[PDB]
């Protein structure tokens, strides 16, 4: 039960079902004590059953219960578990990620196969918690809250900070992903090369595996945190460590377009 803007309250439908159940159970106990005729007791027992139903699974038996003012059925426990964008169904769409990011991609021709151009402004946010600690290790900040307050404004960004970010991302790699991810190579790991500009620079050779072109495709970026996750990304997932199609056994990273043309 939570209050929103204005004085209005937003709350789950479950609470109404629980409520009517309780009302009917209590009225039942009362009617029992009063020694009421079995007619009324039956009616209340029945309404109690129906209420327990509607709570557990709404609409499955009899008419669906609705709050006055709307024809929408109250979402019950069964609906919550599955079937109207349900638990098991919500876990198909996926959960948002904390260290993620997204931008528009442009061609990276100067990049080596294992590298990707990452906007400085973007990398700063992605790697920030590591960056604070690297600001502490250097003489750029006294403490964490300090460095954190230092990055809060773009005008307050020192030219020493980028030298620290370059240290943070040294040896590290990030994941680039382009939707739809049809096969595993739709997500690859590159080591980031910090660049001016708002675009992610992508190696041309990996465009085929990603099915990525430059007409305005965007790619998501992710940061592996654990030394473990980093390791996995760097051996198993590194762009330059998958040269051949896991499907056909033939090379996936190969000369194409302009390259072929020139050669």
């Amino acid at each position: 039960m939570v209050q929103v803007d204005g004085g209005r309250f937003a709350t789950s439908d479950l609470n109404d079902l629980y409520r009517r159940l309780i009302n009917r159970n209590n009225r039942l106990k009362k009617l029992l004590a009063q020694g009421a005729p079995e007619i009324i007791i039956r009616n209340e027992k029945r309404m109690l059953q129906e209420a327990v139903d509607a709570l557990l699974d709404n609409g499955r038996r009899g008419a669906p219960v609705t709050n006055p003012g709307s024809d929408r059925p109250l979402r019950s426990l069964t609906d919550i578990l599955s079937g109207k964008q349900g638990r098991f169904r919500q876990n198909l769409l996926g959960k948002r990620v904390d260290y993620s990011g997204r931008s528009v991609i442009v061609v990276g021709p100067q990049l080596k196969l294992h590298q990707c151009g990452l906007p400085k402004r973007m990398a700063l946010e992605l790697f920030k918690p590591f960056l604070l600690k690297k600001m502490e290790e250097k003489g750029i900040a006294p403490n964490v809250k300090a460095a954190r307050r230092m990055l809060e404004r773009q005008r307050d960004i020192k030219d020493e900070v980028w030298d620290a970010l370059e240290e943070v991302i040294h040896g590290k790699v990030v994941l680039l992903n382009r939707a739809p991810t049809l096969h595993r190579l739709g997500i690859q790991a590159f080591q980031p090369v910090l660049v001016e500009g708002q675009s992610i620079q992508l190696h041309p050779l990996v465009c085929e595996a990603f099915n990525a072109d430059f007409d305005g495709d965007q790619m998501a970026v992710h940061v592996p945190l654990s030394s473990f996750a980093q390791a996995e990304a760097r051996i198993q997932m590194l762009s330059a460590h998958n040269l051949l199609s896991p499907a056909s056994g033939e090379p996936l990273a190969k000369p194409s377009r302009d390259i072929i043309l020139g050669l």
Partner: peptide
């Protein structure tokens, strides 16, 4: 089904 009808019938008996 339609317990209103059921109960109203039970009442109709009396």
């Amino acid at each position: 089904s339609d317990p209103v009808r059921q109960y109203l019938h039970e009442i109709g008996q009396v």
